[PDB]
């Protein structure tokens, strides 16, 4: 999951499983998820569990 513009409008939404979390399909992402600025904008990350 990343971020991107859609429908040739000013809508920038989130494809992928991260986007799923954003919309209310589940409330925890337990999987090999990474960490970076964009994602850390609006999602809370646990302390890192594997380096």
């Amino acid at each position: 999951g990343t971020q991107e513009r859609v429908q040739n409008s000013n809508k920038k939404e989130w494809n992928g499983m991260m986007g799923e979390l954003l919309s209310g399909q589940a409330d925890m992402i337990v999987a090999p998820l990474t960490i970076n600025n964009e994602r850390a904008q609006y999602i809370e990350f646990s302390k890192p569990f594997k380096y």
Binding site: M17, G24, Q25, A26, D27, M28, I29, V30, A31, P32
Partner: protein
């Protein structure tokens, strides 16, 4: 000199009332009264606008609601028509927020506030009862869109318990019949305080399906604007619903008088200014703008009427009412009541006691944490093995080198 003003109304009584009002304000630069009825077609009225303006060389025209309930267009033509010459127009009962715009209606200032701000007030009822979580339920339309814009700006105005933080907005579709789908997503969520703002006709469907949806019992809390209570909506509203009213609901003469007073207070400051060029009544002949158009509007934007029959009348940064008063009304056993009164930041409760749906007499927490959440997970090799089930439905249990059972959710 002598300046002329006009208005369009639907009662000869208020016509004579406006005539008396200008006769009285004459004590405060002579003013000439002109008035016209309305018609059951925008055609004749769109004719009447110049048919009377050219006759009068008006300097401002007053307008209110006709007997039409919706009347989404009855303040349309008369507005931009005068806009053709930058003729500042004043309205009374124009709530439908289209006219809120500056562009399409550069020639419009209203008396009451439009539904936007009566949504905006809910911030304080949230602040008092320490509520935090809200489901926003609006219809898909320009009106609802404006409601969203206003409320989102309001909540965002928190740059500093986090207070409130909205967690869903449902693009309810206008005019529909089947609803329950959205209501399902509503039920599954973790909150109870819902805020519904929609047509005065479809809240009936909403209440019907919701009572059928059983999401209207205890623990639930509602709020609405104005149109959601009256009409046949009242005939389907569950108890405990909280509603909001304006302090000057339908009182023509009141606003008429306040208006002629404030426009006198304006013209007295007008006529003592330089370069005052009369807007010509030659809409047929002339085709340009009396600079005393936007000039008139720029000068209007500074007045502060002392006190009217509706108290202090002040205008916002966009040309609409500022600081009105509201009655925090309620529904109690199919008997509407009053409970509180809002003005400014003052939110005064009163004698009678509030009730909440289901008969509870507490201020419920608005939300209880769930305990059955969902989980997402990708298919990645050493972290998440994916394997088909056994024929029995489960999958076969194995052992590691240590021989232990391997968990296989």
């Amino acid at each position: 000199k002598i300046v002329n003003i006009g208005a369009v109304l639907s009662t000869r009584k208020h016509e004579q009332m406006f005539r008396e009002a200008v006769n009285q304000a004459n004590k405060r630069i002579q003013l000439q009264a002109t008035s016209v009825t309305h018609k059951p077609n925008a055609i004749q009225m769109a004719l009447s606008v110049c048919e009377d303006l050219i006759s009068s060389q008006v300097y401002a025209i007053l307008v209110s609601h006709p007997p039409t309930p919706n009347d989404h267009f009855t303040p349309t033509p008369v507005s931009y028509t005068a806009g053709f010459y930058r003729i500042p127009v004043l309205g009374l009962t124009t709530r439908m927020s289209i006219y809120s715009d500056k562009s399409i209606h550069l020639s419009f200032l209203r008396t009451v506030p439009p539904y936007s701000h009566q949504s905006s007030v809910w911030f304080e009822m949230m602040r008092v009862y320490n509520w935090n979580h809200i489901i926003l339920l609006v219809s898909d339309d320009h009106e609802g869109r404006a409601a969203q814009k206003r409320l989102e700006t309001l909540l965002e105005e928190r740059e500093s318990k986090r207070g409130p933080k909205a967690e869903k907005v449902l693009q309810f579709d206008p005019g529909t019949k089947n609803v329950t789908a959205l209501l399902m997503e509503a039920r599954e969520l973790e909150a109870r305080v819902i805020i519904l703002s929609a047509s005065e006709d479809d809240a009936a469907t909403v209440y019907r399906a919701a009572a059928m949806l059983d999401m209207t019992g205890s623990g639930y809390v509602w709020l609405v604007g104005e149109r959601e209570i009256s009409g046949n909506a009242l005939r389907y509203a569950p108890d405990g619903i909280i509603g909001l009213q304006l302090i000057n609901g339908k009182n023509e003469s009141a606003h008429i008088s306040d208006a002629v007073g404030v426009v006198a207070q304006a013209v007295h400051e007008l006529l003592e200014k330089e370069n005052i060029t009369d807007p010509p009544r030659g809409c047929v002949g002339n085709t340009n703008i009396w600079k005393t158009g936007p000039l008139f509007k720029r000068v209007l934007m500074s007045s502060k009427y002392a006190d009217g029959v509706t108290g202090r009348v002040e205008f916002n940064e966009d040309g609409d009412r500022k600081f009105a008063q509201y009655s925090i009304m309620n529904l109690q056993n199919r008997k509407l009541v009053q409970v509180g009164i809002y003005n400014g930041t003052h939110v005064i409760p009163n004698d009678r006691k509030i009730i909440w749906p289901g008969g509870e007499t507490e201020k419920p927490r608005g939300y209880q944490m769930s305990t059955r959440l969902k989980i997402v997970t990708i298919h990645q090799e050493p972290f998440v093995y994916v394997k088909p089930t056994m024929s029995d439905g489960t999958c076969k249990e194995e052992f590691t080198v240590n021989g232990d059972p391997v968990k296989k959710v």
